[PDB]
Short mmCIF file of C-alpha atoms in Angstrom, two decimals:
data_model
loop_
_atom_site.label_atom_id
_atom_site.label_comp_id
_atom_site.label_asym_id
_atom_site.label_seq_id
_atom_site.Cartn_x
_atom_site.Cartn_y
_atom_site.Cartn_z
CA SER A 158 -42.09 -10.34 56.58
CA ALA A 159 -44.92 -8.60 54.78
CA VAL A 160 -44.80 -11.25 52.11
CA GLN A 161 -45.17 -14.14 54.50
CA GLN A 162 -48.11 -12.36 56.18
CA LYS A 163 -49.77 -11.84 52.81
CA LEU A 164 -49.17 -15.45 51.74
CA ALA A 165 -50.65 -16.66 55.02
CA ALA A 166 -53.69 -14.46 54.46
CA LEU A 167 -54.02 -15.77 50.92
CA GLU A 168 -53.88 -19.29 52.25
CA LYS A 169 -56.51 -18.57 54.91
CA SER A 170 -58.78 -17.05 52.30
CA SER A 171 -58.40 -20.08 50.03
CA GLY A 172 -59.34 -22.87 52.44
CA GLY A 173 -56.38 -25.00 51.40
CA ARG A 174 -52.71 -25.53 52.07
CA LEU A 175 -50.24 -23.40 50.14
CA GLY A 176 -46.53 -24.02 49.70
CA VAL A 177 -44.23 -21.44 48.12
CA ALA A 178 -40.55 -21.23 47.49
CA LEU A 179 -38.84 -18.34 45.74
CA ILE A 180 -35.14 -18.24 44.94
CA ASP A 181 -33.86 -14.86 43.79
CA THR A 182 -30.65 -15.66 41.92
CA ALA A 183 -29.48 -12.05 42.29
CA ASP A 184 -28.42 -12.66 45.92
CA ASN A 185 -29.41 -16.33 46.43
CA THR A 186 -32.04 -15.18 48.91
CA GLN A 187 -35.05 -17.43 49.46
CA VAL A 188 -38.64 -16.80 50.47
CA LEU A 189 -40.40 -19.86 51.84
CA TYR A 190 -43.92 -20.57 52.95
CA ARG A 191 -44.47 -24.13 54.15
CA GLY A 192 -41.19 -24.65 52.36
CA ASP A 193 -40.36 -27.96 54.05
CA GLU A 194 -43.81 -29.54 53.93
CA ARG A 195 -44.54 -32.27 51.44
CA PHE A 196 -46.99 -31.65 48.65
CA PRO A 197 -48.17 -33.93 45.85
CA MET A 198 -46.21 -33.04 42.77
CA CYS A 199 -48.72 -34.22 40.19
CA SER A 200 -47.48 -33.23 36.73
CA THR A 201 -44.71 -31.02 38.03
CA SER A 202 -42.87 -34.34 38.31
CA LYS A 203 -42.65 -34.40 34.54
CA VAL A 204 -39.81 -31.92 34.64
CA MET A 205 -37.66 -34.47 36.51
CA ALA A 206 -38.47 -37.25 34.04
CA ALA A 207 -37.63 -35.11 31.07
CA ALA A 208 -34.42 -33.89 32.66
CA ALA A 209 -33.40 -37.43 33.48
CA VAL A 210 -33.75 -38.37 29.81
CA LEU A 211 -31.80 -35.28 28.84
CA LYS A 212 -29.05 -36.39 31.20
CA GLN A 213 -28.95 -39.78 29.48
CA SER A 214 -28.55 -38.02 26.15
CA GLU A 215 -25.27 -36.49 27.25
CA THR A 216 -23.68 -39.91 26.71
CA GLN A 217 -26.17 -41.37 24.18
CA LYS A 218 -25.91 -38.47 21.79
CA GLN A 219 -28.73 -39.60 19.49
CA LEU A 220 -31.15 -40.70 22.25
CA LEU A 221 -33.63 -37.89 21.77
CA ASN A 222 -34.18 -38.99 18.17
CA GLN A 223 -35.01 -42.56 19.20
CA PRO A 224 -38.52 -43.48 18.02
CA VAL A 225 -40.87 -44.91 20.56
CA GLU A 226 -44.07 -46.72 19.62
CA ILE A 227 -47.37 -45.37 20.84
CA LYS A 228 -49.81 -48.25 21.12
CA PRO A 229 -53.51 -48.04 22.13
CA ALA A 230 -52.74 -49.82 25.37
CA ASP A 231 -50.32 -47.03 26.22
CA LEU A 232 -52.99 -44.38 26.33
CA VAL A 233 -54.12 -43.28 29.75
CA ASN A 234 -56.47 -40.56 30.89
CA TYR A 235 -55.04 -37.38 29.29
CA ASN A 236 -52.95 -37.80 26.14
CA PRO A 237 -53.48 -34.80 23.89
CA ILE A 238 -50.36 -35.35 21.84
CA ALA A 239 -49.84 -39.08 22.11
CA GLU A 240 -53.40 -39.62 20.83
CA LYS A 241 -52.31 -37.96 17.59
CA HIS A 242 -49.62 -40.60 17.11
CA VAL A 243 -51.32 -43.85 18.12
CA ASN A 244 -50.02 -46.74 15.99
CA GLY A 245 -47.08 -44.58 15.05
CA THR A 246 -43.97 -43.37 16.77
CA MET A 247 -42.83 -40.30 18.62
CA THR A 248 -39.21 -39.56 19.37
CA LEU A 249 -38.00 -39.12 22.93
CA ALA A 250 -37.64 -35.43 22.22
CA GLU A 251 -41.24 -35.25 21.04
CA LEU A 252 -42.39 -37.18 24.10
CA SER A 253 -40.40 -34.88 26.38
CA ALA A 254 -41.98 -31.83 24.72
CA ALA A 255 -45.42 -33.32 24.97
CA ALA A 256 -45.02 -34.19 28.63
CA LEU A 257 -43.78 -30.73 29.43
CA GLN A 258 -45.75 -28.41 27.17
CA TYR A 259 -49.08 -30.22 27.06
CA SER A 260 -48.78 -32.31 30.24
CA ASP A 261 -49.34 -35.46 28.24
CA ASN A 262 -49.62 -38.39 30.62
CA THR A 263 -48.80 -41.10 28.08
CA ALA A 264 -45.65 -39.21 27.23
CA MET A 265 -44.68 -39.17 30.91
CA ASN A 266 -45.18 -42.91 31.17
CA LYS A 267 -42.91 -43.46 28.19
CA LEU A 268 -40.25 -41.29 29.84
CA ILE A 269 -40.59 -43.28 33.06
CA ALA A 270 -40.20 -46.52 31.09
CA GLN A 271 -37.08 -45.21 29.38
CA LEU A 272 -35.59 -44.56 32.80
CA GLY A 273 -36.41 -48.04 34.11
CA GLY A 274 -39.39 -47.15 36.25
CA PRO A 275 -40.17 -44.52 38.84
CA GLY A 276 -37.07 -45.54 40.70
CA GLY A 277 -35.02 -44.32 37.76
CA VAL A 278 -36.59 -40.87 37.95
CA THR A 279 -36.00 -40.75 41.66
CA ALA A 280 -32.42 -41.85 41.15
CA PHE A 281 -31.76 -38.89 38.91
CA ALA A 282 -33.05 -36.55 41.59
CA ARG A 283 -30.68 -38.14 44.08
CA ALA A 284 -27.81 -37.88 41.61
CA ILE A 285 -28.21 -34.12 41.34
CA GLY A 286 -28.55 -33.71 45.11
CA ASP A 287 -32.28 -33.71 45.66
CA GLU A 288 -32.87 -36.02 48.61
CA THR A 289 -36.53 -35.04 48.91
CA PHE A 290 -38.15 -35.78 45.59
CA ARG A 291 -39.75 -39.17 45.33
CA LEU A 292 -41.59 -40.62 42.38
CA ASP A 293 -43.37 -43.81 43.31
CA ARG A 294 -46.06 -44.34 40.71
CA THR A 295 -46.81 -43.86 37.06
CA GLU A 296 -49.57 -41.90 35.40
CA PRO A 297 -52.34 -41.46 36.26
CA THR A 298 -52.19 -42.81 39.81
CA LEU A 299 -49.37 -40.50 40.88
CA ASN A 300 -51.99 -37.74 41.03
CA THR A 301 -54.12 -39.17 43.81
CA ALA A 302 -52.77 -36.48 46.16
CA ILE A 303 -54.08 -38.19 49.27
CA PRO A 304 -53.45 -36.12 52.39
CA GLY A 305 -50.52 -37.42 54.30
CA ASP A 306 -49.41 -39.89 51.67
CA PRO A 307 -45.68 -39.38 51.01
CA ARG A 308 -45.77 -41.05 47.61
CA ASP A 309 -45.03 -38.77 44.66
CA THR A 310 -44.27 -35.74 46.77
CA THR A 311 -41.60 -33.17 47.24
CA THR A 312 -41.22 -29.96 49.18
CA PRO A 313 -41.28 -26.47 47.75
CA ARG A 314 -37.77 -25.78 48.92
CA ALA A 315 -36.39 -28.91 47.33
CA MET A 316 -38.14 -28.40 44.03
CA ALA A 317 -37.06 -24.79 43.80
CA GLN A 318 -33.46 -25.76 44.35
CA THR A 319 -33.69 -28.60 41.81
CA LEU A 320 -35.41 -26.47 39.21
CA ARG A 321 -32.69 -23.84 39.63
CA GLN A 322 -29.97 -26.43 39.12
CA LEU A 323 -31.61 -27.90 36.04
CA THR A 324 -32.35 -24.63 34.25
CA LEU A 325 -29.92 -22.01 35.51
CA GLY A 326 -27.23 -24.26 36.94
CA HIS A 327 -25.19 -27.00 35.41
CA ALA A 328 -26.89 -30.23 36.48
CA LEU A 329 -27.30 -30.80 32.76
CA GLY A 330 -25.00 -30.29 29.85
CA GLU A 331 -25.18 -27.01 27.99
CA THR A 332 -27.25 -28.22 25.05
CA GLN A 333 -29.55 -30.16 27.38
CA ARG A 334 -30.13 -27.24 29.71
CA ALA A 335 -30.93 -25.01 26.79
CA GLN A 336 -33.37 -27.58 25.48
CA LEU A 337 -35.11 -27.86 28.82
CA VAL A 338 -35.41 -24.05 29.06
CA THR A 339 -36.81 -23.90 25.56
CA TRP A 340 -39.35 -26.56 26.40
CA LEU A 341 -40.45 -24.81 29.62
CA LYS A 342 -40.76 -21.42 27.89
CA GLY A 343 -43.09 -23.06 25.40
CA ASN A 344 -45.45 -24.46 27.95
CA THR A 345 -49.08 -24.15 26.89
CA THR A 346 -50.90 -24.92 30.17
CA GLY A 347 -49.68 -22.12 32.42
CA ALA A 348 -51.52 -19.01 31.41
CA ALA A 349 -53.83 -18.89 34.45
CA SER A 350 -51.23 -19.91 37.03
CA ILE A 351 -47.95 -18.16 38.01
CA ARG A 352 -47.85 -16.26 34.69
CA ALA A 353 -51.14 -14.55 35.47
CA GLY A 354 -49.74 -12.88 38.58
CA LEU A 355 -46.64 -11.53 36.85
CA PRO A 356 -45.91 -8.53 34.62
CA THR A 357 -46.69 -9.45 31.02
CA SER A 358 -43.19 -8.42 29.95
CA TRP A 359 -41.45 -11.06 32.07
CA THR A 360 -40.47 -14.29 30.37
CA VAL A 361 -41.64 -17.39 32.16
CA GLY A 362 -40.93 -21.04 31.70
CA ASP A 363 -43.17 -23.26 33.83
CA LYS A 364 -44.76 -26.61 34.40
CA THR A 365 -48.20 -26.93 35.93
CA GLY A 366 -49.69 -29.81 37.78
CA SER A 367 -53.09 -30.79 38.95
CA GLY A 368 -54.61 -33.70 40.72
CA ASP A 369 -57.20 -34.84 43.14
CA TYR A 370 -57.87 -32.93 46.38
CA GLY A 371 -58.00 -29.84 44.14
CA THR A 372 -54.26 -29.98 43.89
CA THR A 373 -53.06 -27.09 41.77
CA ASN A 374 -49.33 -26.61 41.27
CA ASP A 375 -46.94 -24.66 39.12
CA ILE A 376 -43.17 -24.41 39.05
CA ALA A 377 -41.48 -21.71 37.14
CA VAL A 378 -38.29 -20.02 36.14
CA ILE A 379 -38.80 -16.32 35.60
CA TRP A 380 -36.64 -13.96 33.60
CA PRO A 381 -37.62 -10.37 34.39
CA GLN A 382 -36.37 -7.87 31.79
CA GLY A 383 -33.06 -6.41 33.08
CA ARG A 384 -32.84 -8.37 36.32
CA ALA A 385 -31.52 -11.72 37.50
CA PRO A 386 -33.88 -14.65 37.11
CA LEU A 387 -36.07 -16.04 39.82
CA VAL A 388 -37.25 -19.58 40.53
CA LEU A 389 -40.77 -19.85 41.96
CA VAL A 390 -42.58 -22.99 43.10
CA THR A 391 -46.24 -22.77 44.16
CA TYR A 392 -48.02 -25.86 45.40
CA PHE A 393 -51.62 -25.88 46.61
CA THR A 394 -53.88 -28.65 47.82
CA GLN A 395 -57.27 -28.77 49.49
CA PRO A 396 -59.06 -30.90 52.02
CA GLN A 397 -61.90 -32.24 49.85
CA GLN A 398 -61.10 -35.05 47.44
CA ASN A 399 -63.31 -33.54 44.71
CA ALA A 400 -62.27 -29.91 45.21
CA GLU A 401 -61.94 -27.86 42.12
CA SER A 402 -58.68 -26.48 40.83
CA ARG A 403 -57.60 -23.10 42.12
CA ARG A 404 -55.12 -21.68 39.63
CA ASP A 405 -56.04 -18.22 40.89
CA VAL A 406 -54.33 -18.99 44.15
CA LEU A 407 -51.08 -19.58 42.32
CA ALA A 408 -51.49 -16.37 40.33
CA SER A 409 -52.14 -14.50 43.55
CA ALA A 410 -49.13 -15.98 45.25
CA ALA A 411 -46.94 -14.99 42.33
CA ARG A 412 -48.37 -11.48 42.46
CA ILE A 413 -47.59 -11.21 46.18
CA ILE A 414 -44.03 -12.38 45.54
CA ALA A 415 -43.58 -10.03 42.60
CA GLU A 416 -44.58 -7.11 44.90
CA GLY A 417 -41.21 -6.81 46.63
CA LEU A 418 -38.65 -7.58 43.98
#
């Protein structure tokens, strides 16, 4: 299609490797570009950790209010919110919000610990039918994004389907789904990514990710005004370990997708 030709041209112009998956929930149609290739998730993996904790809270009704200590040894490389609470506590809800809306890496590690390690996050993916997602490491080493390395990867197709189930479907309970949607809509790190390629009137909930090899990712649910929602995953990675981030590629991919709907 025109769209796949324009995404391939965008990719060629960028020098990197682009993966896109769009689900249009109007007709359940999908648009895929490198949809079954693995890409490093980087911080887009935080959505799965937060959702796994939300799933636990369906049985442990008070779990999100559980206070969790933030100690100096817990701090890693990027902790904008946790740093504000060192030698204090944050609740699991606050940690989930921080991981999602500020991409706080300490917060992610606390979520992973709550789930019993990376294997607990992966298990949740398997439990909701995602056989592709794999979380192998904690922060910050899950962002190494080494070409070919299957650790901490997923495919665009799988992540789009999982994000749909978590936000628009019923993989989570009603209150949990609504909480996740509220958290995603409040993301603070996404302005230059998918959102920048979309009409300003559309409501977007997203999670960005970035890592080495100039890896620049964003996963979003999109609510156009008067029109069924869309799920859009855009993953991008580059051949040079020290490449700079290319959020513009994600914006451009979103724009190409939006031309057509």
